[PDB]
Amino acid sequence: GAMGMSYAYLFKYIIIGDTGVGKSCLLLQFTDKRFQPVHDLTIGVEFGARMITIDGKQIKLQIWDTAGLEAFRSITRSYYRGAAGALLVYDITRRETFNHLTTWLEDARQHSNSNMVIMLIGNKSDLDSRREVKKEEGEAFAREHGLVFMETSARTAANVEEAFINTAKEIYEKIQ
Ligand SMILES: Nc1nc2c(ncn2[C@@H]2O[C@H](COP(=O)(O)OP(=O)(O)NP(=O)(O)O)[C@@H](O)[C@H]2O)c(=O)[nH]1
Numbered sequence: 001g002a003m004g005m006s007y008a009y010l011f012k013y014i015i016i017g018d019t020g021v022g023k024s025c026l027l028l029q030f031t032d033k034r035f036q037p038v039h040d041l042t043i044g045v046e047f048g049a050r051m052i053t054i055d056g057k058q059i060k061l062q063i064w065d066t067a068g069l070e071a072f073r074s075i076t077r078s079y080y081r082g083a084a085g086a087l088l089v090y091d092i093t094r095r096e097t098f099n100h101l102t103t104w105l106e107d108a109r110q111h112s113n114s115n116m117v118i119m120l121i122g123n124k125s126d127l128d129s130r131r132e133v134k135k136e137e138g139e140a141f142a143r144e145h146g147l148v149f150m151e152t153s154a155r156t157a158a159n160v161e162e163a164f165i166n167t168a169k170e171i172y173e174k175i176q
């Protein structure tokens, strides 16, 4: 397809974060409204895509789902380039995935535009009894670094639509 032919804008997203935080399940819940209970480790980039409506216009999201597993991750961070948005994801039940955010963020901004809209996502909000990271901590990291923030559950679909749609609304407001 092409912008000005089969859609008004194409917004490229990348989804980054530690292994098991729920990147792939967020994507699948977004496009297919299905929850995948098994952890299938992503290795190369996997592409997802969906049409959305923003301000009455047809926008296509091209979504690059990436490997969290360090053993599978390339040292060449070339797949950042061209992304209008990034979904930066951690597991609210696993403190270490939150501690790695600084490095993911640095990685993201060193190989992408300062332009890029970054949505910080605390996923697995359905597992409240196992919470290790306060909602306030994710809120504060976002503010401190000029990100938007949302907690989601790929399992129950809570805020999943909003995570992807609000990212696009942010991009839209930025560029027009
Ligand atoms: N309870 C619950 N489990 C979730 C949620 N999101 C993902 N999971 C589970 O967590 C595991 C990891 O999901 P996955 O999306 O594969 O994570 P990933 O970030 O893509 N991992 P990788 O980087 O290795 O590809 C799966 O077993 C999945 O079912 C959620 O919101 N709630």
Ligand SMILES: [Mg+2]
Binding pocket: 023, 024, 025, 040, 041, 042, 065, 066, 067, 068
């Ligand atoms: Mg994955």
